[PDB]
Amino acid sequence: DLEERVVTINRVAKVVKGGRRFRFTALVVVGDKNGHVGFGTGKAQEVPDAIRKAVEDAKKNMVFVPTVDTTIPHTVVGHFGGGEILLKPASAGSGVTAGGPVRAVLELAGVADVSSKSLGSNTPINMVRATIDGIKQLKNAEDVAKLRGKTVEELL
RNA sequence: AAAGAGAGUUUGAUCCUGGCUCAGGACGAACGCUGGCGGCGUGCCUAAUACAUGCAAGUCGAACGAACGG
Numbered sequence: 154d155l156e157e158r159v160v161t162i163n164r165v166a167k168v169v170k171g172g173r174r175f176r177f178t179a180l181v182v183v184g185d186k187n188g189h190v191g192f193g194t195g196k197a198q199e200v201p202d203a204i205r206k207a208v209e210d211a212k213k214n215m216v217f218v219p220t221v222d223t224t225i226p227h228t229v230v231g232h233f234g235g236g237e238i239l240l241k242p243a244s245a246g247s248g249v250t251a252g253g254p255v256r257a258v259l260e261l262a263g264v265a266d267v268s269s270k271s272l273g274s275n276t277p278i279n280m281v282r283a284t285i286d287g288i289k290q291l292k293n294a295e296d297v298a299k300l301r302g303k304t305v306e307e308l309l
Numbered sequence: 310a311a312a313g314a315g316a317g318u319u320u321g322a323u324c325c326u327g328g329c330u331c332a333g334g335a336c337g338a339a340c341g342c343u344g345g346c347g348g349c350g351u352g353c354c355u356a357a358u359a360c361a362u363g364c365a366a367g368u369c370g371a372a373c374g375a376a377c378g379g
């Protein structure tokens with residue numbers, strides 16, 4: 154059982170001879186607070202039907218976020234097109250400090266204390282892409298030692 | 310140890326670039342409506358413009374020649 158959060162609902166149009174036909178596009182972030190999160194996109198003639206398509210789509214982009222002490226292991230920078238996101242660990246109890254669409258991908262992912270800053274564009278779809286582009290770079294300390302052949306206490 | 314929030318606006322609809330505007334904090338402040346108290350501070354930013362009237366620099370008879378008091 155996952156949680157839903159509608160980010161943006163936008164009305165788009167294509168021009169056809171007689172006039173204009175309008176459609177609704179919805180962007181939805183889905184995940185459980187344990188560390189899994191994903192996003193999707195839908196399109197329909199009605200707002201309720203656009204969400205349902207986006208929920209099913211979002212269940213195909215699930216990603217895992219590694220966290221230590223309810224905080225990301227280190228500092229990463231996302232990048233996707235014209236949008237980029239800076240994610241930074243923060244002290245316990247500070248809470249999430251994030252912009253509009255980047256809060257959803259962090260509160261749903263279960264991260265409790267993290268600081269961020271959007272250095273790029275403002276488009277909601279490119280902020281979600283640029284954020285997940287940062288979670289990919291995120292590594293745990295346990296796995297780093299495994300690649301480097303060291304042990305955890307030797308690293309730190 | 311500390312550690313950074315965005316939004317509106319070009320288009321039939323979109324993505325970028327890009328300016329304009331807004332949400333926060335601070336004044337030796339002024340103006341508008343209203344107005345109980347106590348503590349601690351502050352009060353000519355302009356004409357270094359012109360100034361009534363009072364007071365802000367005196368003291369020593371144990372350094373040297375006086376007036377009340379027989």
Ligand SMILES: [Mg+2]
Pocket residue numbers: none
């Ligand atoms: Mg228009």
Ligand SMILES: [Mg+2]
Pocket residue numbers: none
């Ligand atoms: Mg701008």
Ligand SMILES: [Mg+2]
Pocket residue numbers: 333
């Ligand atoms: Mg501030």
Ligand SMILES: [Mg+2]
Pocket residue numbers: 333
């Ligand atoms: Mg304000």
Ligand SMILES: [Mg+2]
Pocket residue numbers: 344
């Ligand atoms: Mg009164």
Ligand SMILES: [Mg+2]
Pocket residue numbers: none
């Ligand atoms: Mg009054």
Ligand SMILES: [Mg+2]
Pocket residue numbers: none
């Ligand atoms: Mg003066």
Ligand SMILES: [Mg+2]
Pocket residue numbers: 357
């Ligand atoms: Mg003069």
Ligand SMILES: [Mg+2]
Pocket residue numbers: none
């Ligand atoms: Mg005089």
Ligand SMILES: [Mg+2]
Pocket residue numbers: none
């Ligand atoms: Mg006097």
Ligand SMILES: [Mg+2]
Pocket residue numbers: 370
């Ligand atoms: Mg004498």
Ligand SMILES: [Mg+2]
Pocket residue numbers: 371
């Ligand atoms: Mg003497």
